[PDB]
Design a protein around this ligand. Structure first.
Ligand SMILES: Cn1c(Cc2nc(N3CCOCC3)cc(=O)[nH]2)nc2ccccc21
Length: 765
């Protein structure tokens, strides 16, 4: 009744009074409208069925021949566990019907299979092989553990989890040192840094830059307000430190004490708004030809809308109204085309609304893949109340996994003052819709706060004393009441399906490096070996570049699995949580190349003998295949993304044989093919052509599949420019993908070019 308001403030890292203190009507209009939208989404959520509620809380973790395996099935009420044998091609209902007959001695449509000690469920018309939990148990050799949960238990859980030419007067400034004005409609100008007042578009930006050559500060603002009315008159521009930047935020600097301010005046012409859609509908040499053929583009080339929207004159109101008439009648564009329109080059709200309309067909799995890029588009946005915010919030309240990651993508960027207001207001609105999930994320917030204090304890002690004494100091600090309660019994921020319960204090350690990252181990009695999970807590380094690289490798694996090619990739979870704060998922039963190299007689034998120890007898044959597929997959991945600084310490190998990279610090500027890995692929033989030429084929096929989806990597990386990455800021960064994948060249021309690069790495081996 009263605690909710106080709980949001602690959770989002900013007090609710701070929004009210600004006295801005736009912020107040957002808080009132979004709350009603979020509460209506929460009202429909309670009206949903028991299976529909499972689709929200526990989304199906699905995979992107008459095998049989035993399954341990138990009930909610009793501790009785009935183990029986089933088939991999069987439906979950068949497993439920078989479990029903076991309890009869000692209807299945009323049950749902819950994964023991996990926030995951098995349901729907899909064979057992299509589930992520089943396939993971098969390679580990473990038997799946499921619990029968009746419809009444899911329904009871739902009830407990409920809620004239344009001119401006340049007055004065106040800066520190020893003013260029320009009008923009996206990435390009409207006039020279010479435009009529009636010839001004709705999404027009007035950009400023203060300099002496030495750049000092910049400031951008919208000509029209949130209520479609042109701004008048006097305005104070709180400048941001630094030629002219149109991509930057249209909101002033919050530090009104130290940052520079510029006073400007907007001359009154009448209370002139912008004409509504109803009124709009009535009204080198290649660019002119494309605009001439505009009707043929709407009828024959719908995909060419992006090229048509760049050629249209935004500085003339006649061309804008003519284009908008076609846009309202324009057919629905596919996912790939809609992602291109979200870029800063297309600022118009109607273009943005058309993109959202085309993005409505996205599945919860597809939305999760591009979620990071969609959150970045919010930075490019002009106003708080927009279609992208409504779409991201509406889908976050429809799927709890989406709502989990959306929150963390907004919470991690709260320390940045340019996005602190927007991201905080979106999180506040989401909390009004999901009251129970707000409490769930609070437990994660308490755990990360304790981890920061534990990392600070380690950072100080490691300098004062040695490594074994600092480890025991960390152990004694963890054993405390406050630490044992906050760090136990919570949903993992890296994966909401994974439950972190008991923390194994003795297994917990730290790396003796510059930032001192924490190693946190867990265990669950209900889950068993599935509950044995680890988390790496890092503080001081920016993990935004590490996550993006790991998300692209995850995307590569998804695109390869779509064409029936499983290159056994290891896409472990990486997620930033705050100011240089983040988490890394531990890939258990794996070690670095350096640790294994340090019995074997030679360096080439070190990796092979380790595989012979973990996979004995005929199990070694699978480990070589697992290594060959993973090496070929990561070889293309490290070449396309351009991952440099590669040594034995940043390359890891699983006990099953799977090879994977870690520590992605530098990207986008050949691929390493050292004989140490080649020796494993060739089964230990000095000369094995039949085993090497197969590996050569896997590298060539993986490269061609990514070339076909070449535009997808180009569209997503262009949207990530808003984040402000140090290695992904200029047009030269996106050019690396155009050079590595060779988009301009044909399928055969790029494959022949790839063969030269493949032989270059083999000659250096
Ligand atoms: C070796 N070591 C590392 C190195 C390190 N390990 C990483 N992981 C990736 C997931 O499987 C486990 C290893 C990812 C990464 O970026 N850096 N971090 C540590 C943190 C605490 C203790 C030891 C640590």
């Amino acid at each position: 009744k009263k605690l909710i308001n106080s709980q949001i403030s602690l959770l989002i890292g900013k007090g609710l009074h701070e929004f009210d203190s600004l006295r801005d009507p736009e912020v107040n209009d957002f808080r009132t409208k979004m709350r009603q939208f979020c509460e209506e989404a929460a009202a429909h959520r309670q009206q949903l069925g028991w299976v529909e509620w499972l689709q929200y809380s526990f989304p199906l973790q699905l995979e992107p021949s008459n095998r049989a395996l035993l399954v341990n099935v138990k009930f909610e009420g009793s501790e009785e566990s009935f183990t029986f044998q089933v088939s991999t091609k069987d439906m979950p209902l068949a497993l439920m019907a078989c479990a029903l007959r076991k309890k009869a001695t000692v209807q299945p449509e009323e049950y749902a299979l819950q994964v023991n000690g996990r926030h995951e469920y098995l349901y729907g018309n899909y064979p057992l092989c299509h589930f992520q939990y089943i396939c993971s148990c098969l390679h580990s050799g473990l038997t799946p553990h499921l619990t029968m949960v009746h419809s009444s238990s899911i329904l009871a859980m739902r009830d407990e989890q409920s809620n004239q030419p344009f001119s401006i007067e340049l007055i004065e400034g106040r800066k520190v040192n020893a003013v260029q004005a320009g009008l923009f409609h996206g990435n390009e100008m409207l006039c020279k840094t010479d435009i009529s007042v009636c010839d001004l578009p709705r999404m027009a930006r007035l950009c400023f830059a203060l300099y002496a050559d030495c750049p000092i500060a910049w400031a951008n603002l919208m000509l029209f307000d949130y209520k479609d009315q042109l701004k008048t008159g006097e305005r104070c521009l709180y400048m941001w430190p630094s030629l002219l930047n149109p991509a930057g935020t249209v909101r002033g600097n919050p530090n009104t004490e130290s940052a520079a301010a510029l006073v400007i005046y907007l001359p009154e012409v009448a209370p002139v708004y912008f004409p509504a859609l109803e009124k709009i509908l009535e009204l080198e040499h290649e660019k002119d030809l494309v605009w001439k053929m505009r009707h043929e583009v709407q009828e024959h080339f719908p995909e060419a809308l992006a090229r048509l929207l760049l050629v249209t004159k935004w500085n003339k109101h006649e061309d804008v109204a003519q284009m908008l008439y076609l846009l309202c009648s324009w057919p629905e564009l596919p996912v790939l085309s809609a992602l291109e329109l979200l870029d800063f080059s297309f600022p118009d709200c109607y273009v943005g609304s058309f993109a959202i309309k085309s993005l409505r067909k996205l599945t919860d799995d597809e939305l999760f893949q591009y979620l990071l890029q969609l959150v970045q588009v919010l930075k490019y946005e002009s106003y708080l109340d927009c279609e992208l915010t409504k779409f991201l919030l509406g889908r976050a309240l429809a799927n709890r996994k989406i709502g989990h990651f959306l929150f963390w993508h907004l919470r991690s960027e709260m320390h940045v003052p340019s996005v602190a207001l927007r991201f905080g207001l979106i999180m506040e609105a989401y909390c009004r819709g999901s009251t129970h999930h707000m409490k769930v994320l609070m437990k994660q917030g308490e755990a990360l706060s304790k981890l920061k204090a534990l990392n600070d304890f380690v950072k100080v002690s490691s300098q004062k004393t040695t490594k074994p004494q600092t480890k025991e100091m960390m152990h004694m600090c963890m054993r405390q009441e406050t630490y044992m309660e906050a760090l136990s019994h919570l949903q993992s921020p890296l994966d909401p399906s994974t439950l972190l319960e008991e923390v194994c204090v003795e297994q917990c350690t730290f790396m003796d490096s510059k930032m001192k990252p924490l190693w946190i181990m867990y265990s669950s009695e209900e889950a068993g070996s599935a509950g044995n999970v680890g988390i790496i807590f890092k503080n001081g380094d920016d993990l935004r570049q590490d996550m993006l690289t790991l998300q692209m490798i995850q995307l590569m694996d998804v695109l390869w699995k779509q064409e029936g090619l499983d290159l056994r990739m290891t896409p472990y979870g990486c997620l930033p949580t705050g100011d240089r704060t983040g988490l890394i998922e531990v890939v258990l039963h794996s070690d670095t190349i350096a640790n294994i190299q340090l019995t074997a007689a030679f360096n080439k034998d070190a990796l092979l003998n380790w595989l012979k120890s973990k996979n004995p007898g005929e199990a070694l044959d699978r480990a070589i295949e697992e290594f060959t597929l993973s090496c070929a997959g990561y070889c293309v991945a490290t070449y396309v993304l351009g991952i440099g600084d590669r040594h034995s310490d940043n390359i890891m190998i699983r006990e099953s044989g799977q090879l994977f990279h870690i520590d992605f610090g530098h990207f986008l500027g050949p691929f390493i093919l050292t004989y140490d890995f080649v020796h494993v692929i060739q089964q230990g033989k000095t000369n094995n052509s039949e085993k090497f030429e197969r590996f050569r084929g896997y590298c060539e096929r993986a490269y061609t599949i990514l070339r076909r989806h070449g535009l997808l990597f180009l569209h997503l990386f262009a949207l990530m420019r808003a984040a402000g990455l140090p290695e992904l800021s200029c047009s030269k960064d996106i050019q690396y993908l155009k050079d590595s994948l060779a988009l301009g060249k044909t399928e055969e021309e790029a494959l022949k070019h790839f063969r030269v690069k493949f032989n270059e790495a083999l000659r250096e081996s």
